[PDB]
Design a protein around this ligand. Structure first.
Ligand SMILES: *[C@H](CCCCCCCCCCCCCCC)CC(=O)[C@@H](*)C(=O)SCCNC(=O)CCNC(=O)[C@H](O)C(C)(C)COP(=O)(O)OP(=O)(O)OC[C@H]1O[C@@H](n2cnc3c(N)ncnc32)[C@H](O)[C@@H]1OP(=O)(O)O
Ligand SMILES: *[C@H](CCCCCCCCCCCCCCC)CC(=O)[C@@H](*)C(=O)SCCNC(=O)CCNC(=O)[C@H](O)C(C)(C)COP(=O)(O)OP(=O)(O)OC[C@H]1O[C@@H](n2cnc3c(N)ncnc32)[C@H](O)[C@@H]1OP(=O)(O)O
Ligand SMILES: CCCCCCC(CCCCCC)(CO[C@H]1O[C@@H](CO)[C@H](O)[C@@H](O)[C@@H]1O)CO[C@H]1O[C@@H](CO)[C@H](O)[C@@H](O)[C@@H]1O
Ligand SMILES: CCCCCCC(CCCCCC)(CO[C@H]1O[C@@H](CO)[C@H](O)[C@@H](O)[C@@H]1O)CO[C@H]1O[C@@H](CO)[C@H](O)[C@@H](O)[C@@H]1O
Ligand SMILES: CCCCCCC(CCCCCC)(CO[C@H]1O[C@@H](CO)[C@H](O)[C@@H](O)[C@@H]1O)CO[C@H]1O[C@@H](CO)[C@H](O)[C@@H](O)[C@@H]1O
Ligand SMILES: CCCCCCC(CCCCCC)(CO[C@H]1O[C@@H](CO)[C@H](O)[C@@H](O)[C@@H]1O)CO[C@H]1O[C@@H](CO)[C@H](O)[C@@H](O)[C@@H]1O
Ligand SMILES: [Cl-]
Ligand SMILES: [Cl-]
Lengths: 254, 256
């Protein structure tokens, strides 16, 4: 009965039949990065994945630039008001482009699971934190419902902003993968964390408009609450990160 | 428990409800049980109680008590030397430090008196006022403030109490005026301005407590309270935005 409200446009798309295939994948991911992986790496030397990391980070930067451009050309730069933007459920070329860009953003969350696989294989267990695993699990898991029910409108603003910030974030990760010699020039590490914090604030301020807009016909109000609560959860997790990494100096720039 | 209680503030040891978190957990368990289950069941086959005079007296008392607690928070540090940045707890037995610890305990105790709001809802059969937002707030605020009085009764952790007592002067004046009757409720056109004040309060509390995460060399003794205050101010901001949405944007509880 609940699946009768799903967008029929995404029915045949990869992983969109039911939430079960992604729950199995993410269950195996959580099991691997927190339990199986570190156990298998315990009596092994770390893997040398410098070239794999550099190629991966470069691909994510270009893929994020592409998804940002597609979100701009699917609505955000061609008519969206930045207030009550509703989903367009028609089979028009522009409405399908916005739906497919949401699907692409969702799929990119599964590719970004490789971040945690690199941490495990490189034996960087200090980077497998609650903040990282929680974010990398709940972002794709919840975005399945966004692609399935509301692939467009005001619910995609945080994705437009996130793909633009992930261009800076994975350029930092790409530059840091070059080695300890190149990490000394990444003095602006704290400015990237500030950008991520400012991103959650802007996402919360944008989605908060939903609660005040009379006659807003955005079709799935529950996503305003999810977006608002998740941006608060990440703002708290990233403020705890800022506190131990910089205020307490556990992960200062090199 | 015995090792964790070795960090408790000995100044508050003998104070009412401060021996252990157990007496307040029993009281709040009975309150949650009463307002969500027992009370409404007993009122189901009864006429509502006429508590107009009891409500007016209670709201008037809470307004004066909030003015008093606000004044005491101002005279215990906020208006006499607190920087509004890294204000550490003063654990000495100096007159100002004890006055701050006293005011925190009074604020904590006032949360138990405020449980009467929900009792008034149940007895008046206003079950639409017994919402998740109300019961959760009224349960979590006193329950958690026991730990604040017990371990850190002062400093930057009390800013939200200074602000909250000042807003509760406006909020219970609204409740007091609406208790006068349907004739007086028509002049309470500013209901949405009070909800805006409550929302702006959570924003200011979050902005103030966020300083903790960035201040180097801040010697505030219980960092865990910075996380609790920030998370609670986010939880209430979300609950009050959902309230604004159904009460005003969808018109379920518009001013009269
Ligand atoms: C999160 C999304 C938020 C969304 C907004 C809220 C609303 C959501 C609603 C969802 C539901 C909607 C429903 C639908 C409605 C329609 C952001 C996001 O998407 C991507 C992110 O990655 S954010 C999380 C990542 N962060 C962390 O893991 C840790 C937190 N720290 C930071 O983010 C920092 O600010 C910083 C980016 C600077 C990283 O700091 P650090 O943790 O301290 O890291 P290091 O400086 O050590 O990193 C250098 C080391 O990492 C190695 N390296 C390089 N490349 C990689 C890769 N790709 N993987 C792993 N490791 C890598 C370097 O080699 C170096 O290690 P070495 O040992 O050589 O020193
Ligand atoms: C919460 C605290 C925030 C703290 C900051 C965050 C961080 C905290 C960290 C804690 C941990 C720290 C650890 C230690 C550190 C060292 C706020 C607070 O303290 C007090 C409050 O009361 S806030 C919540 C109350 N609100 C609600 O219940 C519902 C939400 N709505 C609102 O708030 C509204 O903005 C408004 C105030 C306008 C009320 O709206 P409404 O719910 O729509 O109400 P009505 O207009 O219907 O009410 C009128 C009816 O109520 C009757 N009435 C009058 N007086 C009373 C009383 N006292 N009790 C019950 N009923 C009453 C009137 O007669 C009228 O009914 P009638 O049938 O006659 O028309
Ligand atoms: C992806 C984001 C980071 C890009 C970094 C750009 C990179 C390094 C390139 C190599 C990167 C490692 C593979 C280009 O910068 C170089 O560009 C040359 C152009 O020919 C200039 O002639 C040279 O002087 C300059 O430093 C450094 O940028 C900055 O460096 C500052 C001094 O720390 C400079 O004050 C600043 O202005 C410059 O912008
Ligand atoms: C295409 C060739 C690019 C070479 C660029 C070298 C790079 C950046 C490295 C970035 C590494 C990527 C993560 C080293 O830059 C740094 O070098 C340090 C010494 O190690 C200095 O202590 C530091 O202050 C300097 O910024 C920038 O160097 C130059 O930038 C010029 C501004 O046009 C300066 O006028 C120039 O004189 C400086 O030298
Ligand atoms: C939210 C954080 C964003 C950080 C953006 C920083 C970013 C990209 C801007 O980089 C640009 O900087 C321009 C100068 O302003 C140059 O003209 C341009 O070539 C360069 O790409 C890289 O710039 C820095 O790169 C350092 C070497 O890693 C340099 O040592 C540093 O001193 C430089 O500042
Ligand atoms: C057990 C009785 C006999 C010993 C007396 C100890 C002494 C006085 C010491 C005087 C100086 C001696 C050189 C410590 O007293 C102080 O000690 C401070 C440091 O811990 C506390 O911060 C402070 O609150 C306490 O009053 C008073 O003990 C009691 O005082 C109570 C309040 O009258 C306290 O609530 C109680 O718990 C404490 O047991
Ligand atoms: Cl962390
Ligand atoms: Cl509500």
């Amino acid at each position: 009965n609940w699946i009768k409200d799903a967008d029929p446009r995404v029915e045949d798309w990869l992983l969109m039949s039911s939430p079960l295939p992604q729950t199995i994948l993410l269950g195996f991911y959580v099991y691997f990065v927190t339990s199986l992986g570190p156990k298998l790496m315990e009596n092994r030397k770390p893997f040398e994945l410098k070239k794999a990391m550099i190629t991966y980070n470069f691909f994510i930067v270009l893929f994020s630039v592409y998804m940002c451009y597609e979100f701009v050309m699917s609505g955000w730069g061609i008519g969206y008001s930045f207030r009550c933007d509703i989903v367009d459920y028609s089979r028009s070329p522009t409405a399908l482009r916005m739906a497919r860009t949401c699907w692409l953003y969702y799929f990119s969350k599964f590719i970004e699971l490789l971040d945690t696989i690199f941490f495990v294989l490189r034996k960087k267990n200090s980077q497998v934190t609650f903040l990282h695993v929680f974010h990398h699990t709940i972002m794709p898991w919840t975005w399945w419902f966004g692609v399935k029910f509301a692939a467009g409108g005001l619910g995609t603003f945080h994705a437009l902003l996130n793909t633009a910030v992930h261009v800076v974030m994975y350029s930092y990760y790409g530059l840091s993968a070059l080695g300890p010699a190149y990490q000394k020039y990444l003095w602006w590490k704290k400015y990237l964390t500030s950008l991520q914090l400012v991103q959650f604030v802007i996402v919360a301020i944008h989605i908060s408009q939903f609660f005040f807009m009379e006659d807003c016909k955005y079709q799935f109000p529950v996503f305003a609450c999810i977006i608002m609560s998740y941006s608060f959860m990440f703002l708290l997790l990233f403020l705890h990160f800022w506190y131990r990494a910089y205020t307490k100096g556990q992960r200062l720039p090199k």
